[PDB]
Write an enzyme that holds these catalytic residues in place. Sequence first.
Site, mmCIF file in Angstrom:
data_model
loop_
_atom_site.group_PDB
_atom_site.id
_atom_site.type_symbol
_atom_site.label_atom_id
_atom_site.label_comp_id
_atom_site.label_asym_id
_atom_site.label_seq_id
_atom_site.Cartn_x
_atom_site.Cartn_y
_atom_site.Cartn_z
ATOM 1 N N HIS A 142 0.648 -1.234 -0.065
ATOM 2 C CA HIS A 142 -0.147 -0.138 0.119
ATOM 3 C C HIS A 142 0.898 1.279 -0.124
ATOM 4 O O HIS A 142 0.773 2.139 -0.763
ATOM 5 C CB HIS A 142 -0.873 -0.014 1.158
ATOM 6 C CG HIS A 142 -2.008 1.161 1.242
ATOM 7 N ND1 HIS A 142 -2.944 0.877 0.751
ATOM 8 C CD2 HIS A 142 -1.614 2.486 1.718
ATOM 9 C CE1 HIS A 142 -3.684 2.237 1.101
ATOM 10 N NE2 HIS A 142 -2.601 3.006 1.788
ATOM 11 N N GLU A 143 1.784 1.326 0.905
ATOM 12 C CA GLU A 143 2.759 2.495 1.133
ATOM 13 C C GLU A 143 3.740 2.598 -0.346
ATOM 14 O O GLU A 143 3.949 3.940 -0.809
ATOM 15 C CB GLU A 143 3.569 2.400 2.315
ATOM 16 C CG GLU A 143 2.812 2.319 3.533
ATOM 17 C CD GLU A 143 1.787 3.284 3.738
ATOM 18 O OE1 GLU A 143 1.918 4.431 3.339
ATOM 19 O OE2 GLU A 143 0.639 2.814 4.476
ATOM 20 N N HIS B 144 1.410 4.303 -2.932
ATOM 21 C CA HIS B 144 1.433 5.715 -2.794
ATOM 22 C C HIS B 144 2.658 6.112 -3.277
ATOM 23 O O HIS B 144 2.911 7.363 -3.934
ATOM 24 C CB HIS B 144 1.001 5.934 -1.373
ATOM 25 C CG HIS B 144 -0.143 6.096 -0.858
ATOM 26 N ND1 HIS B 144 -1.224 6.769 -1.370
ATOM 27 C CD2 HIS B 144 -0.787 5.277 0.273
ATOM 28 C CE1 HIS B 144 -2.432 6.412 -0.706
ATOM 29 N NE2 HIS B 144 -1.967 5.394 0.257
HETATM 30 C C1 LIG Z 1 -5.487 -2.399 9.726
HETATM 31 N N1 LIG Z 1 -5.222 -0.949 9.705
HETATM 32 C C2 LIG Z 1 -5.785 0.189 8.935
HETATM 33 O O1 LIG Z 1 -6.786 -0.334 8.036
HETATM 34 C C3 LIG Z 1 -5.494 1.611 8.803
HETATM 35 C C4 LIG Z 1 -6.844 2.315 9.122
HETATM 36 C C5 LIG Z 1 -8.089 1.630 10.046
HETATM 37 C C6 LIG Z 1 -7.432 1.564 11.643
HETATM 38 C C7 LIG Z 1 -8.457 0.648 12.279
HETATM 39 C C8 LIG Z 1 -9.939 0.298 11.641
HETATM 40 C C9 LIG Z 1 -10.179 0.428 10.638
HETATM 41 C C10 LIG Z 1 -8.940 1.247 9.507
HETATM 42 N N2 LIG Z 1 -5.258 2.038 7.457
HETATM 43 C C11 LIG Z 1 -3.842 2.522 7.446
HETATM 44 O O2 LIG Z 1 -3.207 2.584 8.190
HETATM 45 C C12 LIG Z 1 -3.214 3.124 5.920
HETATM 46 C C13 LIG Z 1 -2.328 2.169 5.503
HETATM 47 C C14 LIG Z 1 -2.780 0.724 5.694
HETATM 48 C C15 LIG Z 1 -4.070 0.496 4.530
HETATM 49 C C16 LIG Z 1 -1.533 -0.211 5.156
HETATM 50 C C17 LIG Z 1 -2.938 4.436 6.014
HETATM 51 C C18 LIG Z 1 -4.259 5.191 6.686
HETATM 52 S S1 LIG Z 1 -3.745 6.695 7.622
HETATM 53 C C19 LIG Z 1 -2.713 6.273 8.903
HETATM 54 C C20 LIG Z 1 -2.938 5.156 9.740
HETATM 55 C C21 LIG Z 1 -1.817 5.486 10.801
HETATM 56 C C22 LIG Z 1 -1.170 6.701 10.844
HETATM 57 S S2 LIG Z 1 -1.641 7.605 9.741
HETATM 58 C C23 LIG Z 1 -2.679 4.913 4.931
HETATM 59 O O3 LIG Z 1 -3.598 5.344 3.846
HETATM 60 N N3 LIG Z 1 -1.424 5.100 4.229
HETATM 61 O O4 LIG Z 1 -1.058 5.536 3.055
HETATM 62 ZN ZN LIG Z 2 -2.784 5.252 1.972
#
Ligand SMILES: CNC(=O)[C@H](Cc1ccccc1)NC(=O)[C@H](CC(C)C)[C@H](CSc1cccs1)C(=O)NO
Ligand SMILES: [Zn+2]
Length: 411
Positions: A22-23, A26
């Site tokens: 994912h990262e 991006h």
């Molecule tokens: C299993 N963890 C997730 O799914 C979380 C969000 C979440 C948390 C709890 C319940 C539901 C969703 N997603 C992410 O961490 C994204 C990256 C993941 C997809 C690899 C992240 C979302 S932003 C931030 C998260 C932490 C600091 S900043 C992103 O988009 N980076 O580009």
């Molecule tokens: Zn993301």
Amino acid sequence: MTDFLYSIFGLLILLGVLVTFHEWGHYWVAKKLGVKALRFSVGFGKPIWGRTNKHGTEFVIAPIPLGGYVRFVDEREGEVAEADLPFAFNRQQVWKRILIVLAGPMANFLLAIVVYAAVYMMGIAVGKPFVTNVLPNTVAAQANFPENSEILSVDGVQVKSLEDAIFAFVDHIKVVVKPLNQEPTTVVLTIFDSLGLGFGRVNGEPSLGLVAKDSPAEKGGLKVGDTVVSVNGESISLWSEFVSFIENNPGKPLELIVARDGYQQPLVVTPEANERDRTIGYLGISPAFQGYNVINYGFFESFGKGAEQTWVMVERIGSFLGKLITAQAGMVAFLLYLAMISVNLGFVNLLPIPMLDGGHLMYYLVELVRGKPVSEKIMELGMRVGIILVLTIMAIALFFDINRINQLYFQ
Ligand SMILES: CNC(=O)[C@H](Cc1ccccc1)NC(=O)[C@H](CC(C)C)[C@H](CSc1cccs1)C(=O)NO
Ligand SMILES: [Zn+2]
């Protein structure tokens, strides 16, 4: 505790792969568009690894992989040197940052697809469509179907599974089936109740193909290639009768006569019942005939079929979300679970939640709506995109018709 090792190893591998891809989606989309990344963080906690790229990007890795981020050059989040503004996130056109935000979930889905395509090449194990029984006064009764037979090709299309059989029967009557002993036949012909057919376990000769080590069969003298001709003095003819005798006699000695190397060997076996139910006998053998089919795919089609499977998965997730508001063991199953979790993440992280990628998508969409300083420009791209489409889908459409020539009256 040894299973804990492999279990948490698979867990960490799955989480790391998903977050990293994912990262990386991006990061790579922003880099190809012209945006300089400042930090590439994977996992929460304290950094266990850290290295700075040649473009000043600091890739850091923490030991609790439950999330991550990619911080780019942005005036909204800190000072930007005058010579770094042309590489800033906010200094790009709105569609560029839209694509950068969309890249993450897409990445996930992409991974899903390829992982699916990776397991469609390696070969997937499905159950043989073995017709166990036939019903009276049905369409199959007058046609006289075989008792215990395997489907080969219905209405022309070659099927190797039960779900494939029902999908072919709803796709559209010729049915090429293989009975025991005799050769295939095109029979003059649940959902099968409309026809009068029932499925079940595969049956065949009481021949042995595998004998597990340190099992009652191995200790009694049973070998591969043996064909049990009689049990307790009674002559048997099907593998089902053999397993019936095995299960019905847990711990009682069975005196078998088997056909072996052209003669007849008498043996004695005491099948032992397992722990979960000490009522069903067991001695550890496998039939010489197979009960599994191996679906294989060409990767040029495996990609499209993995995409279709991801679409099925996301529609399943949509059904589950709207309501809320066979066994192929091995690593091949671990990869399927990894791809499914990837699809789950790619869906959930796209919801219009403020801190998630969906909220950023909403924010930049409303910013694009507010910013309309030029007309007939948004329409311009509307063709230049479509052109590419009517070009790329043309190219394949050409290549397709090219590959059919490379393939091509004997009797
Ligand atoms: C299993 N963890 C997730 O799914 C979380 C969000 C979440 C948390 C709890 C319940 C539901 C969703 N997603 C992410 O961490 C994204 C990256 C993941 C997809 C690899 C992240 C979302 S932003 C931030 C998260 C932490 C600091 S900043 C992103 O988009 N980076 O580009
Ligand atoms: Zn993301």
